[PDB]
Design a protein around this nucleic acid. Structure first.
Ligand code: MG
Ligand code: MG
Ligand code: MG
Ligand code: MG
Ligand code: MG
Ligand code: MG
Ligand code: MG
Ligand code: MG
Ligand code: MG
Ligand code: MG
Ligand code: MG
Ligand code: MG
Ligand code: MG
Ligand code: MG
Ligand code: MG
Ligand code: MG
Ligand code: MG
Ligand code: MG
Ligand code: MG
Ligand code: MG
Ligand code: MG
Ligand code: MG
Ligand code: MG
Ligand code: MG
Ligand code: MG
Ligand code: MG
Ligand code: MG
Ligand code: MG
Ligand code: MG
Ligand code: MG
Ligand code: MG
Ligand code: MG
Ligand code: MG
Ligand code: MG
Ligand code: MG
Ligand code: MG
Ligand code: MG
Ligand code: MG
Ligand code: MG
Ligand code: MG
Ligand code: MG
Ligand code: MG
Ligand code: MG
Ligand code: MG
Ligand code: MG
Ligand code: MG
Ligand code: MG
Ligand code: MG
Ligand code: MG
Ligand code: MG
Ligand code: MG
Ligand code: MG
Ligand code: MG
Ligand code: MG
Ligand code: MG
Ligand code: MG
Ligand code: MG
Ligand code: MG
Ligand code: MG
Ligand code: MG
Ligand code: MG
Ligand code: MG
Ligand code: MG
Ligand code: MG
Ligand code: MG
Ligand code: MG
Ligand code: MG
Ligand code: MG
Ligand code: MG
Ligand code: MG
Ligand code: MG
Ligand code: MG
Ligand code: MG
Ligand code: MG
Ligand code: MG
Ligand code: MG
Ligand code: MG
Ligand code: MG
Ligand code: MG
Ligand code: MG
Ligand code: MG
Ligand code: MG
Ligand code: MG
Ligand code: MG
Ligand code: MG
Ligand code: MG
Ligand code: MG
Ligand code: MG
Ligand code: MG
Ligand code: MG
Ligand code: MG
Ligand code: MG
Ligand code: MG
Ligand code: MG
Ligand code: MG
Ligand code: MG
Ligand code: MG
Ligand code: MG
Ligand code: MG
Ligand code: MG
Lengths: 185, 234, 157, 51, 148
RNA sequence: GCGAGAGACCGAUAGCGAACAAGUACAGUGAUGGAAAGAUGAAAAGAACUUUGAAAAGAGAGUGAAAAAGUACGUGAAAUUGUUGAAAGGGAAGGGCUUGAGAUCAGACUUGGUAUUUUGCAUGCGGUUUACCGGGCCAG
RNA sequence: GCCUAGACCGAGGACUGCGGUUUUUACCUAGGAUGUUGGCAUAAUGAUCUUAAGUCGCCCGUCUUGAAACACGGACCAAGGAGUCUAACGUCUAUGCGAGUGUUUGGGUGUAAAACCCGUACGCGUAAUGAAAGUGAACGAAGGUGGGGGCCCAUUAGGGUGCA
RNA sequence: UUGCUUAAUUGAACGUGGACAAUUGAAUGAAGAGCUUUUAGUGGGCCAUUUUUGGUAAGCAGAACUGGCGAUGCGGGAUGA
RNA sequence: AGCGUGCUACUUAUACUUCACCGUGAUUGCUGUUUUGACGCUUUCACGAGUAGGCAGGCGUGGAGGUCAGUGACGAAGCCUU
């Protein structure tokens, strides 16, 4: 017998493959499973893990997020890498010339990148002009902006969003939300 | 014609392997001379220390004095109690000693912190002061290293060098010397060593184990009789 | 069983064995097994017969003769583990055993004329040396058996 | 694939410890100690016999 | 599909995953929103504060059409300009000739002032504007024209 | 209600209560309650005749592709039962593990290689037995 | 240091490693059993069934702190027999599109309850807050500080840039 | 640096710049640390050592810490949570 | 063959040591030899009790789309059987 100091037969708790059965995402995993196993480049190991992520773990990257990252000092000609969908932003006043590699482009995003003199390439095209991800810059979308996160960790004096179907003066505003109605939490 | 292709590849890679092994053996000959010299020096200093202690005892006897031995700096602790019904504090102490099964053995450098640790685990372990031959036999027969959190047999000095060369341990005898005369890198060498998984004694225990060695049991400090106990169990 | 088809990656080639390092070393015989020693056969057709040991063949077997006239045990091979080596000894320095080997006893009822001639030639010298010790021919012609109260762990042979 | 005891397999013993050869060659396991026949307890250490 | 449900995996186990002591009963705790002030207060107070009580004044016969006023901010205001002519307007706009943006005809009641405008004159027709929204429009050389 | 076309539905304890002389037989004073119950065979060709028996029936026989389909009707499970055979059995029986005994089953002389003997066939094919090479299994 | 008796095991399957003996790029006991002999192939060998013998073995299911219970149901067998569907929802995941999204109410069409096509509205989202009248989101590179994967310059170290 | 504080050029807090380099400041261990969402069953307990209350006591009733049974087979205590 | 005590040997758990095999978790490496399986192959190490309960991977049934140009009156399905 053994006095176990840790739980036995515990899975790692990380995705080792996409949950998706899309064969074309699998081909991308095929390529970066080989790259992460053989280049010693930390970029390729990050990309392989990011290809496994679920939809909420790869939030969309607006074309505005890429613009601010390209506005970093000495990052104007870097290659923007988005493991996910790049969406359009009709609130932008202008977009630069840039090379962006993404899983997917929206119609507005593809139009805008090419309209301003840039390139919209896929992640396999990235692996030939940058097999070690040289002079790249990975952009991730906001994770805590999701609507479901509004209600996470709800409680007294927690300031989170109640799980409610209707909004108005008659819906969860009287007792427990007001000192004139007892207490406020 | 793949027969001749694979035969050519095998003979070419065999020739390259032969040349590389020639060079490797020539380079390793010097390393083996180094470890030979180290082992001879260790034997010489063991003998010198023994004879020095013997001479000091004889001189103190002659000069109307009493030679008081240096207190032991090393102890070997064997968990002889099963894994059921252990209070949380001695359980944590046994876990921190890497004694998580019966008949598991570990090397401990005697100070105050570790002494109070072993005192907490005392009702569940048998420990004592190991001799050089006991350490050698333990490391030779049941010596394993922790390599990438795996228990690997110590079957070649390259494993020891690859894991303890930054601590100046290049051989199994370097490791044994570092353990016996408690050295500056005792911590790293003993933690690299997987806990020894001993058998039960050939000849049995005493009639009742779970009482102190002083009271006719098996737990506590038996000192030089740890060698007999290890002889029974290894 | 089921309907599971073999796959293309299910090869049928038989791998060669690894290079074995079981280089044979010569047999060690017991110190009591010295040519000329009287042996007791424990198994086989001639179990219980007292016989003369002549030569150590390269097959790890022992060359043995009755002699055939005294015993009915011809020239043949026995295994050393089916033999009791007694302490009685016969001088076989005058017995020519050069021509005897494993190939002599090769498997090809009847019996070869060569074998009969060799039997007589060996048995002549064997009998000549046996006659010197009184009752040795009678001892060899008598079978061995365990009597009531015989403890082989206490008897000396 | 199979752990061999250096205390049983002499080849593995020489592989791990080359000085074992010298230990065997020099008879280090039965080395004599040179000293005089003395007895330094004739005096006050006889306090052990009685008090 | 029913073949994927855990009812199929509980077959052969006595209690069907419901427990042997607690068991599955008709309605322990009551039906619906029962006991919200007595034994379900700990749930409603923690997760739905404000549930019990009245707040504010009633409004008999409230017609939501009266309060229809969709909002558009300033950073989205130029999206109401024709897509095929946006770049021309961004270039040739001046005080003498600036694009007209009819916000009501696009479905908006009030112009709010989040974000930044191109430094380009525009004519914005709105039912309502905020104080800061109109200040930002005039700074780029534009004007707000009230409509109904 | 009338007239139609359909179904990832049920398949005679299901599907309407009812696939049938089903709101039938039957109960209750009455209001009401309310079943069970489909299948020989392509075709009755539904077994003439003889014989024993008081008869039902049986035995021959006949029809039939089948009577291992006879309206006790296709197929014909289990509980339960007869006979035959086998075994076991001192106040239950039954079970696991292990081996014995009996019965049953399995497997390399392989698609074995080399020529011979020797024979059926379309110079050649398969078989067979004798030689040698070697192989399988159990052991020393 | 030396000699000696027995038991169990033989995983792996061309080579690759570390050593030893080196008479030699020779051999070895050194990264896991080979060699040889006999017998058997109408069979030695193995399995199951039945049964005997040895040893152990209380009736399941249930509620229960506790069941073999002197607690309850169960004589036997067959067939049937119990977490479903729906309205509205939470988490997570996959997919399509994306500041939009949703063809199916309806219209067109059809080989006719399918498939295919169409669009206005509308729902949700794109703004919140206040009981309400109402008001309504850039000081700054859409902020500062300490971390932060990855990326850039380096040259242990160090510096720059630093998404989530 | 401040709108705070001091009689103040005093302090308070947050800072710019500089010095102290792997014995960077005890031991031992570490199948690594940290984080999030969501949901089942449960909410009758009991026992052993030790501490302990009521009671004459109880196979009684009630607490403290730990370990167990419950939920657990295996060897021993013949038998037995 | 009782009681107190000492000694020598001996007995045997699903426990401990070594080994075989199963599974789980991790791990070494695997595309100019990746080679018709990379959801794949391979090296190594550790671990394995379980009611209520969760999850995973599978076995079986009625019916449906597709496929096997599948079986079948020269015998389907069903039923009995060391
Ligand atoms: Mg275990
Ligand atoms: Mg939000
Ligand atoms: Mg935000
Ligand atoms: Mg330690
Ligand atoms: Mg013994
Ligand atoms: Mg003993
Ligand atoms: Mg002892
Ligand atoms: Mg004992
Ligand atoms: Mg005892
Ligand atoms: Mg031992
Ligand atoms: Mg005679
Ligand atoms: Mg289960
Ligand atoms: Mg389950
Ligand atoms: Mg269960
Ligand atoms: Mg049941
Ligand atoms: Mg259950
Ligand atoms: Mg449940
Ligand atoms: Mg129940
Ligand atoms: Mg309950
Ligand atoms: Mg009340
Ligand atoms: Mg409305
Ligand atoms: Mg009709
Ligand atoms: Mg009709
Ligand atoms: Mg019709
Ligand atoms: Mg019916
Ligand atoms: Mg029919
Ligand atoms: Mg019928
Ligand atoms: Mg018919
Ligand atoms: Mg017809
Ligand atoms: Mg008739
Ligand atoms: Mg008749
Ligand atoms: Mg008849
Ligand atoms: Mg006929
Ligand atoms: Mg028939
Ligand atoms: Mg029949
Ligand atoms: Mg029929
Ligand atoms: Mg009948
Ligand atoms: Mg029929
Ligand atoms: Mg019938
Ligand atoms: Mg029957
Ligand atoms: Mg009988
Ligand atoms: Mg009786
Ligand atoms: Mg009787
Ligand atoms: Mg009984
Ligand atoms: Mg019985
Ligand atoms: Mg049997
Ligand atoms: Mg048998
Ligand atoms: Mg053999
Ligand atoms: Mg093998
Ligand atoms: Mg040569
Ligand atoms: Mg070897
Ligand atoms: Mg029995
Ligand atoms: Mg019994
Ligand atoms: Mg019950
Ligand atoms: Mg009760
Ligand atoms: Mg029960
Ligand atoms: Mg009673
Ligand atoms: Mg009772
Ligand atoms: Mg009860
Ligand atoms: Mg009763
Ligand atoms: Mg009851
Ligand atoms: Mg009962
Ligand atoms: Mg009853
Ligand atoms: Mg059924
Ligand atoms: Mg809309
Ligand atoms: Mg339609
Ligand atoms: Mg129609
Ligand atoms: Mg409002
Ligand atoms: Mg107010
Ligand atoms: Mg500083
Ligand atoms: Mg200290
Ligand atoms: Mg939680
Ligand atoms: Mg929960
Ligand atoms: Mg919970
Ligand atoms: Mg809960
Ligand atoms: Mg609950
Ligand atoms: Mg109770
Ligand atoms: Mg309860
Ligand atoms: Mg006590
Ligand atoms: Mg105590
Ligand atoms: Mg109590
Ligand atoms: Mg206890
Ligand atoms: Mg319970
Ligand atoms: Mg237990
Ligand atoms: Mg027991
Ligand atoms: Mg017991
Ligand atoms: Mg007792
Ligand atoms: Mg007794
Ligand atoms: Mg006594
Ligand atoms: Mg005694
Ligand atoms: Mg003893
Ligand atoms: Mg086992
Ligand atoms: Mg085995
Ligand atoms: Mg792997
Ligand atoms: Mg595959
Ligand atoms: Mg388990
Ligand atoms: Mg199915
Ligand atoms: Mg159905
Ligand atoms: Mg089908
Ligand atoms: Mg049967």
């Amino acid at each position: 017998g053994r006095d176990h100091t840790s739980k036995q037969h515990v899975r790692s708790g990380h995705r080792t493959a996409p949950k998706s059965d899309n064969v074309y995402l699998q081909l991308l995993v095929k390529l970066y499973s080989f790259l992460a196993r053989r280049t010693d480049a930390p970029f390729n190991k990050v990309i392989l893990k990011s290809l496994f992520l679920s939809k909420i773990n790869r939030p969309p990257v607006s074309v505005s997020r890429i613009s601010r990252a390209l506005k970093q000092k000495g990052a104007a000609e870097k290659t923007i890498v988005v493991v996910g969908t790049v969406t359009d932003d009709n609130r932008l006043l202008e977009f630069p010339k840039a090379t962006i590699a993404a899983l997917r482009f929206t119609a507005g995003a593809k139009d805008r990148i090419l309209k301003n003199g840039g390139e919209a390439i896929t992640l396999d095209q990235l692996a030939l002009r940058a097999p070690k991800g040289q002079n790249t810059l990975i952009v991730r979308g906001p994770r805590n902006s999701r609507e479901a996160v509004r209600h996470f960790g709800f409680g007294p004096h927690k300031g989170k969003a109640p799980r409610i179907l209707s909004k108005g003066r008659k819906f969860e505003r009287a007792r427990g939300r007001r000192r004139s109605r007892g207490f406020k939490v | 014609e793949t027969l001749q292709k694979k035969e050519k590849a095998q003979q070419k890679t065999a020739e390259e392997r032969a040349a590389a092994k020639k060079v490797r053996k020539a380079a390793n000959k010097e390393k083996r001379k180094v470890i030979f010299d180290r082992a001879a020096a260790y034997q010489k200093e063991y003998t010198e220390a023994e004879r020095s202690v013997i001479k000091a005892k004889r001189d103190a006897k002659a000069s109307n004095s009493y030679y008081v031995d240096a207190q032991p700096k090393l102890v070997f602790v064997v968990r002889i109690k099963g894994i059921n019904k252990i209070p949380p504090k001695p359980r944590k102490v046994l876990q921190l000693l890497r004694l998580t099964q019966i008949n598991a053995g570990v090397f401990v450098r005697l100070t105050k912190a570790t002494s109070e640790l072993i005192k907490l685990a005392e009702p569940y372990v048998a420990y004592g002061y190991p001799s050089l031959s006991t350490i050698r036999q333990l490391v030779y027969k049941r010596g394993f290293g922790k390599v990438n959190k795996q228990r690997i047999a110590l079957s070649d000095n390259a494993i020891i060098e690859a894991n303890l060369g930054k601590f100046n341990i290049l051989s199994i005898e370097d490791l044994i010397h570092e353990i016996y005369t408690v050295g500056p890198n005792f911590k790293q060498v003993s933690n690299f060593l997987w806990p020894f998984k001993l058998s039960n004694p050939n000849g049995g225990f005493r009639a009742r184990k779970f009482q102190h060695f002083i009271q006719g049991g098996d737990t506590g400090n038996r000192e030089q009789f740890i060698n007999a106990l290890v002889k029974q169990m290894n | 069983m089921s309907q599971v088809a073999p796959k293309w990656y299910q090869s049928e080639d038989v791998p060669a064995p690894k290079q074995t390092r079981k280089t044979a070393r010569p047999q060690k015989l017991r110190a009591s097994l010295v040519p000329g020693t009287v042996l007791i056969l424990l198994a086989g057709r001639f179990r219980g017969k007292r016989v003369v040991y002549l030569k150590n063949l390269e097959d790890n077997t022992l060359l043995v003769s009755g002699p055939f006239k005294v015993n009915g045990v011809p020239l043949r091979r026995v295994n050393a583990r089916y033999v009791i080596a007694t302490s009685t000894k016969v001088n076989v320095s005058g017995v020519d055993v050069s021509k005897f080997n494993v190939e002599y006893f090769a498997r090809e009822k009847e019996i070869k004329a060569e074998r009969v001639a060799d039997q007589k030639s060996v048995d002549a010298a064997l009998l000549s040396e046996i006659k010197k010790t009184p009752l040795l021919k009678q001892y060899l012609a008598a079978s061995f058996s365990l009597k009531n109260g015989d403890r082989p762990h206490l008897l000396k042979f | 694939v199979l752990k061999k005891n250096p205390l049983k397999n002499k080849q593995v013993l020489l592989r791990l410890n080359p000085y074992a050869k010298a230990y065997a060659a020099e008879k280090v396991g039965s080395a004599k100690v040179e000293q005089a026949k003395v007895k330094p307890s004739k005096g006050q250490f006889a306090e052990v016999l009685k008090n | 599909p029913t073949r994927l449900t855990k009812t199929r995996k509980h077959r052969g186990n006595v209690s069907a995953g419901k427990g042997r002591i607690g068991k599955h009963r008709k309605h322990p705790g009551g039906r619906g929103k029962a006991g919200g002030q007595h034994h379900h207060r700990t749930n409603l107070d923690k997760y739905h504060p404000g549930y019990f009580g009245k707040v504010g004044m009633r409004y008999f016969h409230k017609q939501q059409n009266h309060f229809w006023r969709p909002e558009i901010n300033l950073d989205k205001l130029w999206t109401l300009v024709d897509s095929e002519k946006k770049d021309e307007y961004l270039s040739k706009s001046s005080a003498s000739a600036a694009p007209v943006i009819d916000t009501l005809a696009h479905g908006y009641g009030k112009v709010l002032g989040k974000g930044r405008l191109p430094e380009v004159p525009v004519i914005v027709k709105a039912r309502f504007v905020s104080k800061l929204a109109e200040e930002k429009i005039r700074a780029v050389g534009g004007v707000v024209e009230l409509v109904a």
